[PDB]
Amino acid sequence: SFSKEESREFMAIFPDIVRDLTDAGRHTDIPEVTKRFAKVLQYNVPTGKKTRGLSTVIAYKMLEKPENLTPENVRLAGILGWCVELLQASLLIMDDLMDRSETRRGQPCWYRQENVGFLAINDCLHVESSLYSVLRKYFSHLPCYVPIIELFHDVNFKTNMGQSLDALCMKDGRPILSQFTMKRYSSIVKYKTSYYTFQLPVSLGMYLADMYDPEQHRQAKTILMEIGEFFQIQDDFLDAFGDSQVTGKVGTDIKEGKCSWLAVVALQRSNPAQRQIMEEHYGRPEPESTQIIKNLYIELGLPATFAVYEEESFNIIRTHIHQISKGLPHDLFFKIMKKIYKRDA
Amino acid sequence: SFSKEESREFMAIFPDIVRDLTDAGRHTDIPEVTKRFAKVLQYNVPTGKKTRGLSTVIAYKMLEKPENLTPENVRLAGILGWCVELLQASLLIMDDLMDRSETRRGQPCWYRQENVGFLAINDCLHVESSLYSVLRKYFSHLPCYVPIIELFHDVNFKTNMGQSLDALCMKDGRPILSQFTMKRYSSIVKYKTSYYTFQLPVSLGMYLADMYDPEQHRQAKTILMEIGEFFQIQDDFLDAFGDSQVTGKVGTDIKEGKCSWLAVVALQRSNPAQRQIMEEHYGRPEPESTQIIKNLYIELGLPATFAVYEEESFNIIRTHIHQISKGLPHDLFFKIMKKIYKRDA
Ligand SMILES: O=P(O)(O)C(O)(Cn1ccnc1)P(=O)(O)O
Ligand SMILES: O=P(O)(O)C(O)(Cn1ccnc1)P(=O)(O)O
Ligand SMILES: C=C(C)CCOP(=O)(O)OP(=O)(O)O
Ligand SMILES: C=C(C)CCOP(=O)(O)OP(=O)(O)O
Ligand SMILES: [Mn+2]
Ligand SMILES: [Mn+2]
Ligand SMILES: [Mn+2]
Ligand SMILES: [Mn+2]
Ligand SMILES: [Mn+2]
Ligand SMILES: [Mn+2]
């Protein structure tokens, strides 16, 4: 699980996905566009950690009867994982535009690159639409096809709802601090991250294994929602405190006024002088105001607060995994937690 | 076809679509975003002329056997038409951002509204994803379900390719005039307009009528791509020469450096002096430059050229309809052609 050989097998599929989308004898009257789209895919799709794609394949191998794990079915799981990566890739291109970000995966964000700009918006829709072309090619004759397309449709819709709720942090260029509660936070991360990052890979593995029991999906969802919140809290910590040479990305939550876990906990922990600092300097374009907030986060001990939370939450999520039933493999959820716990990117 | 009673019938379905997407007992934990999404849908979806949605219904009524046209099946054709309007709505939200436009349908472009901006990209993705939720609710029990889903995803991909070819008119802040050929133009229009505007309504009517023969779809496509080319040429003409109070939108093609029909024909007709005016002034943000280009278009006689094209093309397409397979209803194509060209005869 998350091994050297699994990574190889997974990356080996990527050149076939590019060929399927750009060199399959289709659209031969517009080679300018298909050759460019091959570059959009090369740049934007395969340079992340690939945890979602690799989790799709691990979930399938842990759910399917061993007797059924052929080179072809394990390749189908890897193709589904790449369709999750195409969805991720599409969401990041949009997200970086919305967040006015500088870098992604160690490079300038796509929209910033020479002669891209507002062509990144279309490129995000194009990458999203491409995953359904991949699904059609490989899954259209299998019983899992309709369930899988419906799941991608539903997760997309839910992710959009979360992205909106996330964006509604600011009104008239000031953040709505009095509404930055843990209740709000948990709602945002459920929709903007947990469905597509955790629920979607495991549900896809289930469907490819012909597991359709609604209660089995519900029990997986309950735990994966808890994992997703934990994973987004880690992301938020990285925005302010991560090493951008390691994470690949420069943080923007403070400048953008976001209802991040750090903002919520800062408001919980602040004395009245510190609350006035949030009121005056949170969600401002000026570099000096963002550093004032970072310095408040340092003085509050948010790094240590996060570290204590992460350890406590890891243990609570594992306790919950142990309570799972409906015939689900505990080690699948244990492996997912081991991969992300104490991550620095 | 295209009467008030038919507009009446079609518009009555819209409030149900909004309820299906925002108030069907789902996502009850995030009313802030579902209430907001009802506003997104009200502003951006039902505010156009609804030609594509109405055309879906008319195609179904002309392709289905007369004995099969129940109120229930006609209502399903109307729901399919609203799914095309959701696709249109989504495309215009993103197009307006890419084209830096001011108005759409007589109101500010969505992105220009307070507290929208690049959140319009998320609302674009959300509106397109919605249509798959509508398809699942109403069509999932019919043979046509999968062909319809696939057509929507394939048309979206093709439209994205067309939008990218459209966008590549400029490189390094100057238009690539030497590549502005009628061959390039026709490729742009096929992909960015003709598939979703003309082919999609008719192929949807075919699928709801259980017409799956790819040859029948292909016979229709030949005519519909000719109508599409006229439709986009008219749109281009009006970008420069239309009244914005009538069109509902302020033109941006000259400033944006687009390979519009006007620019393509201007380069065809220009003497060397007139070509140097295009080289110096086309695709520039300065208002003097954009007025100099409009003056060159007047000097070249482009309004009269367009008027000749509108006459010549109408008579060519009518002649081509007469030659379609006796297997398809010629009057469907005549009705579509007459609506687009605003003719009763
Ligand atoms: O913090 P965000 O939600 O914008 C982020 O996690 C992206 N994202 C978008 C939706 N869910 C996650 P990233 O930090 O990668 O920029
Ligand atoms: O001229 P465009 O292609 O941008 C346009 O026709 C929209 N559009 C987008 C794709 N096909 C058409 P509009 O003039 O409405 O802004
Ligand atoms: C949901 C979130 C936190 C977005 C980034 O996801 P990752 O941190 O998994 O990014 P990549 O590996 O895909 O780059
Ligand atoms: C493809 C084109 C020319 C975009 C606008 O289409 P319409 O002129 O049909 O727009 P609405 O009626 O939907 O506003
Ligand atoms: Mn971001
Ligand atoms: Mn974001
Ligand atoms: Mn983040
Ligand atoms: Mn436009
Ligand atoms: Mn455009
Ligand atoms: Mn136009």
mmCIF file with all atom_site columns, all heavy atoms in Angstrom, chain A residues 91-92 95-96 99 101 104 159 163 166 192-193 196-197 232 235-236 239 249 253 258, ligand 1:
data_model
loop_
_atom_site.group_PDB
_atom_site.id
_atom_site.type_symbol
_atom_site.label_atom_id
_atom_site.label_alt_id
_atom_site.label_comp_id
_atom_site.label_asym_id
_atom_site.label_entity_id
_atom_site.label_seq_id
_atom_site.pdbx_PDB_ins_code
_atom_site.Cartn_x
_atom_site.Cartn_y
_atom_site.Cartn_z
_atom_site.occupancy
_atom_site.B_iso_or_equiv
_atom_site.pdbx_formal_charge
_atom_site.auth_seq_id
_atom_site.auth_comp_id
_atom_site.auth_asym_id
_atom_site.auth_atom_id
_atom_site.pdbx_PDB_model_num
ATOM   1   N N   . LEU A 1 91  ? -10.171 20.432 -10.845 1.00 0.00 ? 91  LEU A N   1
ATOM   2   C CA  . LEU A 1 91  ? -10.553 21.278 -9.685  1.00 0.00 ? 91  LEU A CA  1
ATOM   3   C C   . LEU A 1 91  ? -9.386  22.225 -9.309  1.00 0.00 ? 91  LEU A C   1
ATOM   4   O O   . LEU A 1 91  ? -9.671  23.406 -8.904  1.00 0.00 ? 91  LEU A O   1
ATOM   5   C CB  . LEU A 1 91  ? -10.923 20.392 -8.513  1.00 0.00 ? 91  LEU A CB  1
ATOM   6   C CG  . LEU A 1 91  ? -12.229 19.610 -8.712  1.00 0.00 ? 91  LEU A CG  1
ATOM   7   C CD1 . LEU A 1 91  ? -12.340 18.527 -7.653  1.00 0.00 ? 91  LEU A CD1 1
ATOM   8   C CD2 . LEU A 1 91  ? -13.443 20.577 -8.617  1.00 0.00 ? 91  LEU A CD2 1
ATOM   9   N N   . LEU A 1 92  ? -8.125  21.763 -9.396  1.00 0.00 ? 92  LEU A N   1
ATOM   10  C CA  . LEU A 1 92  ? -6.964  22.594 -8.988  1.00 0.00 ? 92  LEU A CA  1
ATOM   11  C C   . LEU A 1 92  ? -6.777  23.756 -9.962  1.00 0.00 ? 92  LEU A C   1
ATOM   12  O O   . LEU A 1 92  ? -6.409  24.833 -9.532  1.00 0.00 ? 92  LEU A O   1
ATOM   13  C CB  . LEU A 1 92  ? -5.709  21.776 -8.756  1.00 0.00 ? 92  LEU A CB  1
ATOM   14  C CG  . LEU A 1 92  ? -5.843  20.668 -7.690  1.00 0.00 ? 92  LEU A CG  1
ATOM   15  C CD1 . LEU A 1 92  ? -4.474  20.024 -7.486  1.00 0.00 ? 92  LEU A CD1 1
ATOM   16  C CD2 . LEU A 1 92  ? -6.439  21.186 -6.375  1.00 0.00 ? 92  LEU A CD2 1
ATOM   17  N N   . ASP A 1 95  ? -9.373  26.165 -8.968  1.00 0.00 ? 95  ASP A N   1
ATOM   18  C CA  . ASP A 1 95  ? -9.142  26.632 -7.590  1.00 0.00 ? 95  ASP A CA  1
ATOM   19  C C   . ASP A 1 95  ? -8.023  27.678 -7.528  1.00 0.00 ? 95  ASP A C   1
ATOM   20  O O   . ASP A 1 95  ? -8.146  28.684 -6.819  1.00 0.00 ? 95  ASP A O   1
ATOM   21  C CB  . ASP A 1 95  ? -8.894  25.422 -6.724  1.00 0.00 ? 95  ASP A CB  1
ATOM   22  C CG  . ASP A 1 95  ? -8.636  25.841 -5.316  1.00 0.00 ? 95  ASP A CG  1
ATOM   23  O OD1 . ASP A 1 95  ? -9.703  26.082 -4.602  1.00 0.00 ? 95  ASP A OD1 1
ATOM   24  O OD2 . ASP A 1 95  ? -7.540  26.030 -4.882  1.00 0.00 ? 95  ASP A OD2 1
ATOM   25  N N   . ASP A 1 96  ? -6.979  27.430 -8.292  1.00 0.00 ? 96  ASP A N   1
ATOM   26  C CA  . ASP A 1 96  ? -5.841  28.363 -8.307  1.00 0.00 ? 96  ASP A CA  1
ATOM   27  C C   . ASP A 1 96  ? -6.225  29.726 -8.898  1.00 0.00 ? 96  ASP A C   1
ATOM   28  O O   . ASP A 1 96  ? -5.774  30.746 -8.388  1.00 0.00 ? 96  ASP A O   1
ATOM   29  C CB  . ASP A 1 96  ? -4.658  27.713 -9.017  1.00 0.00 ? 96  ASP A CB  1
ATOM   30  C CG  . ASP A 1 96  ? -3.996  26.660 -8.141  1.00 0.00 ? 96  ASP A CG  1
ATOM   31  O OD1 . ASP A 1 96  ? -4.136  26.724 -6.921  1.00 0.00 ? 96  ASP A OD1 1
ATOM   32  O OD2 . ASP A 1 96  ? -3.272  25.781 -8.781  1.00 0.00 ? 96  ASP A OD2 1
ATOM   33  N N   . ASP A 1 99  ? -8.380  31.395 -6.108  1.00 0.00 ? 99  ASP A N   1
ATOM   34  C CA  . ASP A 1 99  ? -7.594  31.691 -4.896  1.00 0.00 ? 99  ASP A CA  1
ATOM   35  C C   . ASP A 1 99  ? -6.452  32.628 -5.222  1.00 0.00 ? 99  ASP A C   1
ATOM   36  O O   . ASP A 1 99  ? -5.719  32.983 -4.291  1.00 0.00 ? 99  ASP A O   1
ATOM   37  C CB  . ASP A 1 99  ? -7.198  30.393 -4.232  1.00 0.00 ? 99  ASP A CB  1
ATOM   38  C CG  . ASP A 1 99  ? -8.370  29.639 -3.701  1.00 0.00 ? 99  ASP A CG  1
ATOM   39  O OD1 . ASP A 1 99  ? -9.442  30.205 -3.597  1.00 0.00 ? 99  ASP A OD1 1
ATOM   40  O OD2 . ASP A 1 99  ? -8.113  28.333 -3.320  1.00 0.00 ? 99  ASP A OD2 1
ATOM   41  N N   . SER A 1 101 ? -3.659  32.087 -6.623  1.00 0.00 ? 101 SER A N   1
ATOM   42  C CA  . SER A 1 101 ? -2.440  31.391 -6.149  1.00 0.00 ? 101 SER A CA  1
ATOM   43  C C   . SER A 1 101 ? -1.270  31.608 -7.099  1.00 0.00 ? 101 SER A C   1
ATOM   44  O O   . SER A 1 101 ? -1.450  31.971 -8.246  1.00 0.00 ? 101 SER A O   1
ATOM   45  C CB  . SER A 1 101 ? -2.792  29.924 -5.905  1.00 0.00 ? 101 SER A CB  1
ATOM   46  O OG  . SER A 1 101 ? -3.669  29.794 -4.764  1.00 0.00 ? 101 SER A OG  1
ATOM   47  N N   . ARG A 1 104 ? 1.681   25.788 -7.890  1.00 0.00 ? 104 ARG A N   1
ATOM   48  C CA  . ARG A 1 104 ? 0.960   24.524 -7.697  1.00 0.00 ? 104 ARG A CA  1
ATOM   49  C C   . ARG A 1 104 ? 1.903   23.402 -8.073  1.00 0.00 ? 104 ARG A C   1
ATOM   50  O O   . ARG A 1 104 ? 2.469   23.458 -9.147  1.00 0.00 ? 104 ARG A O   1
ATOM   51  C CB  . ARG A 1 104 ? -0.265  24.497 -8.592  1.00 0.00 ? 104 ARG A CB  1
ATOM   52  C CG  . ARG A 1 104 ? -0.966  23.147 -8.605  1.00 0.00 ? 104 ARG A CG  1
ATOM   53  C CD  . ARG A 1 104 ? -1.634  22.695 -7.315  1.00 0.00 ? 104 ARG A CD  1
ATOM   54  N NE  . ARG A 1 104 ? -2.744  23.551 -6.969  1.00 0.00 ? 104 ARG A NE  1
ATOM   55  C CZ  . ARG A 1 104 ? -3.446  23.425 -5.850  1.00 0.00 ? 104 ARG A CZ  1
ATOM   56  N NH1 . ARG A 1 104 ? -3.142  22.516 -4.941  1.00 0.00 ? 104 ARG A NH1 1
ATOM   57  N NH2 . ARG A 1 104 ? -4.444  24.270 -5.606  1.00 0.00 ? 104 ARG A NH2 1
ATOM   58  N N   . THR A 1 159 ? -19.066 18.804 -4.880  1.00 0.00 ? 159 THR A N   1
ATOM   59  C CA  . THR A 1 159 ? -17.773 19.533 -4.797  1.00 0.00 ? 159 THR A CA  1
ATOM   60  C C   . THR A 1 159 ? -18.027 21.013 -5.159  1.00 0.00 ? 159 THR A C   1
ATOM   61  O O   . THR A 1 159 ? -17.490 21.879 -4.506  1.00 0.00 ? 159 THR A O   1
ATOM   62  C CB  . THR A 1 159 ? -16.719 18.875 -5.683  1.00 0.00 ? 159 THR A CB  1
ATOM   63  O OG1 . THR A 1 159 ? -16.567 17.495 -5.293  1.00 0.00 ? 159 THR A OG1 1
ATOM   64  C CG2 . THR A 1 159 ? -15.398 19.563 -5.500  1.00 0.00 ? 159 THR A CG2 1
ATOM   65  N N   . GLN A 1 163 ? -17.163 24.282 -2.915  1.00 0.00 ? 163 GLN A N   1
ATOM   66  C CA  . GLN A 1 163 ? -16.323 25.371 -3.455  1.00 0.00 ? 163 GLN A CA  1
ATOM   67  C C   . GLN A 1 163 ? -17.047 26.696 -3.294  1.00 0.00 ? 163 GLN A C   1
ATOM   68  O O   . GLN A 1 163 ? -16.428 27.714 -3.006  1.00 0.00 ? 163 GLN A O   1
ATOM   69  C CB  . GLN A 1 163 ? -15.910 25.055 -4.871  1.00 0.00 ? 163 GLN A CB  1
ATOM   70  C CG  . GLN A 1 163 ? -14.851 25.969 -5.411  1.00 0.00 ? 163 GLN A CG  1
ATOM   71  C CD  . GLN A 1 163 ? -13.447 25.639 -4.893  1.00 0.00 ? 163 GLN A CD  1
ATOM   72  O OE1 . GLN A 1 163 ? -13.230 24.801 -3.928  1.00 0.00 ? 163 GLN A OE1 1
ATOM   73  N NE2 . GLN A 1 163 ? -12.489 26.269 -5.583  1.00 0.00 ? 163 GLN A NE2 1
ATOM   74  N N   . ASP A 1 166 ? -17.096 27.661 0.495   1.00 0.00 ? 166 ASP A N   1
ATOM   75  C CA  . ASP A 1 166 ? -15.733 28.124 0.775   1.00 0.00 ? 166 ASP A CA  1
ATOM   76  C C   . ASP A 1 166 ? -15.552 29.582 0.331   1.00 0.00 ? 166 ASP A C   1
ATOM   77  O O   . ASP A 1 166 ? -14.876 30.376 1.036   1.00 0.00 ? 166 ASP A O   1
ATOM   78  C CB  . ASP A 1 166 ? -14.767 27.196 0.077   1.00 0.00 ? 166 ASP A CB  1
ATOM   79  C CG  . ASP A 1 166 ? -13.299 27.547 0.225   1.00 0.00 ? 166 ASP A CG  1
ATOM   80  O OD1 . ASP A 1 166 ? -12.828 28.385 -0.519  1.00 0.00 ? 166 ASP A OD1 1
ATOM   81  O OD2 . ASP A 1 166 ? -12.673 27.004 1.170   1.00 0.00 ? 166 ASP A OD2 1
ATOM   82  N N   . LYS A 1 192 ? -16.376 20.370 -0.128  1.00 0.00 ? 192 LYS A N   1
ATOM   83  C CA  . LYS A 1 192 ? -15.294 20.798 -1.064  1.00 0.00 ? 192 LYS A CA  1
ATOM   84  C C   . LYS A 1 192 ? -14.173 19.782 -1.194  1.00 0.00 ? 192 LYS A C   1
ATOM   85  O O   . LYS A 1 192 ? -13.408 19.891 -2.151  1.00 0.00 ? 192 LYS A O   1
ATOM   86  C CB  . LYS A 1 192 ? -14.728 22.174 -0.737  1.00 0.00 ? 192 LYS A CB  1
ATOM   87  C CG  . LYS A 1 192 ? -13.751 22.230 0.426   1.00 0.00 ? 192 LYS A CG  1
ATOM   88  C CD  . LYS A 1 192 ? -12.914 23.446 0.419   1.00 0.00 ? 192 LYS A CD  1
ATOM   89  C CE  . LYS A 1 192 ? -11.959 23.486 1.594   1.00 0.00 ? 192 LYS A CE  1
ATOM   90  N NZ  . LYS A 1 192 ? -11.102 24.691 1.578   1.00 0.00 ? 192 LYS A NZ  1
ATOM   91  N N   . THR A 1 193 ? -14.065 18.847 -0.220  1.00 0.00 ? 193 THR A N   1
ATOM   92  C CA  . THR A 1 193 ? -12.917 17.937 -0.228  1.00 0.00 ? 193 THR A CA  1
ATOM   93  C C   . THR A 1 193 ? -13.324 16.470 0.026   1.00 0.00 ? 193 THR A C   1
ATOM   94  O O   . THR A 1 193 ? -12.828 15.611 -0.705  1.00 0.00 ? 193 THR A O   1
ATOM   95  C CB  . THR A 1 193 ? -11.921 18.413 0.827   1.00 0.00 ? 193 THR A CB  1
ATOM   96  O OG1 . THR A 1 193 ? -11.288 19.577 0.308   1.00 0.00 ? 193 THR A OG1 1
ATOM   97  C CG2 . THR A 1 193 ? -10.877 17.343 1.155   1.00 0.00 ? 193 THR A CG2 1
ATOM   98  N N   . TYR A 1 196 ? -14.912 14.007 -2.931  1.00 0.00 ? 196 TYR A N   1
ATOM   99  C CA  . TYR A 1 196 ? -14.108 13.615 -4.113  1.00 0.00 ? 196 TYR A CA  1
ATOM   100 C C   . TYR A 1 196 ? -12.774 13.037 -3.714  1.00 0.00 ? 196 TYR A C   1
ATOM   101 O O   . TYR A 1 196 ? -12.202 12.250 -4.509  1.00 0.00 ? 196 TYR A O   1
ATOM   102 C CB  . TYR A 1 196 ? -13.907 14.794 -5.087  1.00 0.00 ? 196 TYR A CB  1
ATOM   103 C CG  . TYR A 1 196 ? -12.698 15.673 -4.835  1.00 0.00 ? 196 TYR A CG  1
ATOM   104 C CD1 . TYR A 1 196 ? -11.541 15.422 -5.541  1.00 0.00 ? 196 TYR A CD1 1
ATOM   105 C CD2 . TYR A 1 196 ? -12.696 16.757 -4.005  1.00 0.00 ? 196 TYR A CD2 1
ATOM   106 C CE1 . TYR A 1 196 ? -10.414 16.216 -5.429  1.00 0.00 ? 196 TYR A CE1 1
ATOM   107 C CE2 . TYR A 1 196 ? -11.572 17.574 -3.858  1.00 0.00 ? 196 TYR A CE2 1
ATOM   108 C CZ  . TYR A 1 196 ? -10.410 17.281 -4.547  1.00 0.00 ? 196 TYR A CZ  1
ATOM   109 O OH  . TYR A 1 196 ? -9.330  18.116 -4.410  1.00 0.00 ? 196 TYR A OH  1
ATOM   110 N N   . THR A 1 197 ? -12.258 13.381 -2.545  1.00 0.00 ? 197 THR A N   1
ATOM   111 C CA  . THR A 1 197 ? -10.907 12.931 -2.207  1.00 0.00 ? 197 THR A CA  1
ATOM   112 C C   . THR A 1 197 ? -10.941 11.548 -1.547  1.00 0.00 ? 197 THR A C   1
ATOM   113 O O   . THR A 1 197 ? -10.011 10.763 -1.765  1.00 0.00 ? 197 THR A O   1
ATOM   114 C CB  . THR A 1 197 ? -10.202 13.960 -1.298  1.00 0.00 ? 197 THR A CB  1
ATOM   115 O OG1 . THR A 1 197 ? -10.086 15.210 -2.015  1.00 0.00 ? 197 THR A OG1 1
ATOM   116 C CG2 . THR A 1 197 ? -8.846  13.494 -0.840  1.00 0.00 ? 197 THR A CG2 1
ATOM   117 N N   . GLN A 1 232 ? -8.294  17.873 5.340   1.00 0.00 ? 232 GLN A N   1
ATOM   118 C CA  . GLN A 1 232 ? -8.395  19.312 5.055   1.00 0.00 ? 232 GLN A CA  1
ATOM   119 C C   . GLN A 1 232 ? -7.826  20.187 6.182   1.00 0.00 ? 232 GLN A C   1
ATOM   120 O O   . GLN A 1 232 ? -7.232  21.233 5.862   1.00 0.00 ? 232 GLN A O   1
ATOM   121 C CB  . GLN A 1 232 ? -9.821  19.705 4.692   1.00 0.00 ? 232 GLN A CB  1
ATOM   122 C CG  . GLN A 1 232 ? -9.932  21.156 4.162   1.00 0.00 ? 232 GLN A CG  1
ATOM   123 C CD  . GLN A 1 232 ? -9.221  21.348 2.842   1.00 0.00 ? 232 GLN A CD  1
ATOM   124 O OE1 . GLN A 1 232 ? -9.369  20.541 1.935   1.00 0.00 ? 232 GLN A OE1 1
ATOM   125 N NE2 . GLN A 1 232 ? -8.458  22.430 2.775   1.00 0.00 ? 232 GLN A NE2 1
ATOM   126 N N   . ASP A 1 235 ? -4.334  20.279 5.383   1.00 0.00 ? 235 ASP A N   1
ATOM   127 C CA  . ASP A 1 235 ? -4.088  21.218 4.280   1.00 0.00 ? 235 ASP A CA  1
ATOM   128 C C   . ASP A 1 235 ? -4.022  22.673 4.780   1.00 0.00 ? 235 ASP A C   1
ATOM   129 O O   . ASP A 1 235 ? -3.240  23.484 4.319   1.00 0.00 ? 235 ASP A O   1
ATOM   130 C CB  . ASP A 1 235 ? -5.152  21.068 3.201   1.00 0.00 ? 235 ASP A CB  1
ATOM   131 C CG  . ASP A 1 235 ? -4.848  21.913 2.016   1.00 0.00 ? 235 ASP A CG  1
ATOM   132 O OD1 . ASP A 1 235 ? -3.841  21.645 1.313   1.00 0.00 ? 235 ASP A OD1 1
ATOM   133 O OD2 . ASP A 1 235 ? -5.633  22.869 1.733   1.00 0.00 ? 235 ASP A OD2 1
ATOM   134 N N   . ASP A 1 236 ? -4.995  23.007 5.640   1.00 0.00 ? 236 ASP A N   1
ATOM   135 C CA  . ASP A 1 236 ? -5.070  24.389 6.133   1.00 0.00 ? 236 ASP A CA  1
ATOM   136 C C   . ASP A 1 236 ? -3.803  24.719 6.920   1.00 0.00 ? 236 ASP A C   1
ATOM   137 O O   . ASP A 1 236 ? -3.326  25.853 6.873   1.00 0.00 ? 236 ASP A O   1
ATOM   138 C CB  . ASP A 1 236 ? -6.331  24.575 6.958   1.00 0.00 ? 236 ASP A CB  1
ATOM   139 C CG  . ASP A 1 236 ? -7.616  24.414 6.187   1.00 0.00 ? 236 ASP A CG  1
ATOM   140 O OD1 . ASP A 1 236 ? -7.604  24.297 4.952   1.00 0.00 ? 236 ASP A OD1 1
ATOM   141 O OD2 . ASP A 1 236 ? -8.672  24.459 6.881   1.00 0.00 ? 236 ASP A OD2 1
ATOM   142 N N   . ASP A 1 239 ? -1.108  25.649 4.584   1.00 0.00 ? 239 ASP A N   1
ATOM   143 C CA  . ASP A 1 239 ? -1.256  26.952 3.886   1.00 0.00 ? 239 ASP A CA  1
ATOM   144 C C   . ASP A 1 239 ? -0.358  27.990 4.605   1.00 0.00 ? 239 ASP A C   1
ATOM   145 O O   . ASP A 1 239 ? 0.321   28.768 3.945   1.00 0.00 ? 239 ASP A O   1
ATOM   146 C CB  . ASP A 1 239 ? -2.709  27.380 3.876   1.00 0.00 ? 239 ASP A CB  1
ATOM   147 C CG  . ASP A 1 239 ? -2.887  28.627 3.004   1.00 0.00 ? 239 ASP A CG  1
ATOM   148 O OD1 . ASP A 1 239 ? -3.092  28.447 1.790   1.00 0.00 ? 239 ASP A OD1 1
ATOM   149 O OD2 . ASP A 1 239 ? -2.851  29.715 3.584   1.00 0.00 ? 239 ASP A OD2 1
ATOM   150 N N   . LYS A 1 249 ? 3.315   24.709 -3.083  1.00 0.00 ? 249 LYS A N   1
ATOM   151 C CA  . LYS A 1 249 ? 2.301   25.756 -3.235  1.00 0.00 ? 249 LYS A CA  1
ATOM   152 C C   . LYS A 1 249 ? 2.517   26.814 -2.152  1.00 0.00 ? 249 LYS A C   1
ATOM   153 O O   . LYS A 1 249 ? 2.852   26.526 -1.010  1.00 0.00 ? 249 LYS A O   1
ATOM   154 C CB  . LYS A 1 249 ? 0.872   25.198 -3.233  1.00 0.00 ? 249 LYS A CB  1
ATOM   155 C CG  . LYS A 1 249 ? 0.462   24.481 -1.938  1.00 0.00 ? 249 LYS A CG  1
ATOM   156 C CD  . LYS A 1 249 ? -0.828  23.698 -2.140  1.00 0.00 ? 249 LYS A CD  1
ATOM   157 C CE  . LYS A 1 249 ? -1.391  23.193 -0.831  1.00 0.00 ? 249 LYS A CE  1
ATOM   158 N NZ  . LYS A 1 249 ? -2.573  22.353 -1.035  1.00 0.00 ? 249 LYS A NZ  1
ATOM   159 N N   . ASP A 1 253 ? -4.687  31.571 2.184   1.00 0.00 ? 253 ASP A N   1
ATOM   160 C CA  . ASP A 1 253 ? -5.952  31.600 2.929   1.00 0.00 ? 253 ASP A CA  1
ATOM   161 C C   . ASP A 1 253 ? -6.096  32.912 3.670   1.00 0.00 ? 253 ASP A C   1
ATOM   162 O O   . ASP A 1 253 ? -7.234  33.400 3.832   1.00 0.00 ? 253 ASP A O   1
ATOM   163 C CB  . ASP A 1 253 ? -6.019  30.417 3.885   1.00 0.00 ? 253 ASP A CB  1
ATOM   164 C CG  . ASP A 1 253 ? -6.199  29.073 3.191   1.00 0.00 ? 253 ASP A CG  1
ATOM   165 O OD1 . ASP A 1 253 ? -6.628  29.043 2.025   1.00 0.00 ? 253 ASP A OD1 1
ATOM   166 O OD2 . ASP A 1 253 ? -6.009  28.011 3.874   1.00 0.00 ? 253 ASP A OD2 1
ATOM   167 N N   . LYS A 1 258 ? -10.179 33.295 4.174   1.00 0.00 ? 258 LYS A N   1
ATOM   168 C CA  . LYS A 1 258 ? -10.900 32.018 4.236   1.00 0.00 ? 258 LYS A CA  1
ATOM   169 C C   . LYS A 1 258 ? -11.264 31.561 5.640   1.00 0.00 ? 258 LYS A C   1
ATOM   170 O O   . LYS A 1 258 ? -10.513 31.812 6.594   1.00 0.00 ? 258 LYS A O   1
ATOM   171 C CB  . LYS A 1 258 ? -10.005 30.949 3.648   1.00 0.00 ? 258 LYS A CB  1
ATOM   172 C CG  . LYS A 1 258 ? -9.783  31.110 2.136   1.00 0.00 ? 258 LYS A CG  1
ATOM   173 C CD  . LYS A 1 258 ? -11.011 30.733 1.321   1.00 0.00 ? 258 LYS A CD  1
ATOM   174 C CE  . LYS A 1 258 ? -11.168 31.363 -0.033  1.00 0.00 ? 258 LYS A CE  1
ATOM   175 N NZ  . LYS A 1 258 ? -9.999  30.999 -0.863  1.00 0.00 ? 258 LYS A NZ  1
HETATM 176 O O1  . LIG C 2 .   ? -7.304  25.207 0.378   1.00 0.00 ? 1   LIG C O1  1
HETATM 177 P P1  . LIG C 2 .   ? -8.137  24.887 -0.906  1.00 0.00 ? 1   LIG C P1  1
HETATM 178 O O2  . LIG C 2 .   ? -9.549  24.386 -0.587  1.00 0.00 ? 1   LIG C O2  1
HETATM 179 O O3  . LIG C 2 .   ? -8.285  26.106 -1.968  1.00 0.00 ? 1   LIG C O3  1
HETATM 180 C C1  . LIG C 2 .   ? -7.165  23.538 -1.673  1.00 0.00 ? 1   LIG C C1  1
HETATM 181 O O4  . LIG C 2 .   ? -7.108  22.427 -0.771  1.00 0.00 ? 1   LIG C O4  1
HETATM 182 C C2  . LIG C 2 .   ? -7.865  23.063 -2.945  1.00 0.00 ? 1   LIG C C2  1
HETATM 183 N N1  . LIG C 2 .   ? -9.180  22.454 -2.777  1.00 0.00 ? 1   LIG C N1  1
HETATM 184 C C3  . LIG C 2 .   ? -10.320 22.791 -3.547  1.00 0.00 ? 1   LIG C C3  1
HETATM 185 C C4  . LIG C 2 .   ? -11.296 22.034 -3.073  1.00 0.00 ? 1   LIG C C4  1
HETATM 186 N N2  . LIG C 2 .   ? -10.863 21.216 -2.052  1.00 0.00 ? 1   LIG C N2  1
HETATM 187 C C5  . LIG C 2 .   ? -9.557  21.485 -1.949  1.00 0.00 ? 1   LIG C C5  1
HETATM 188 P P2  . LIG C 2 .   ? -5.444  24.042 -2.067  1.00 0.00 ? 1   LIG C P2  1
HETATM 189 O O5  . LIG C 2 .   ? -4.800  24.307 -0.738  1.00 0.00 ? 1   LIG C O5  1
HETATM 190 O O6  . LIG C 2 .   ? -4.748  22.925 -2.769  1.00 0.00 ? 1   LIG C O6  1
HETATM 191 O O7  . LIG C 2 .   ? -5.428  25.281 -2.914  1.00 0.00 ? 1   LIG C O7  1
#
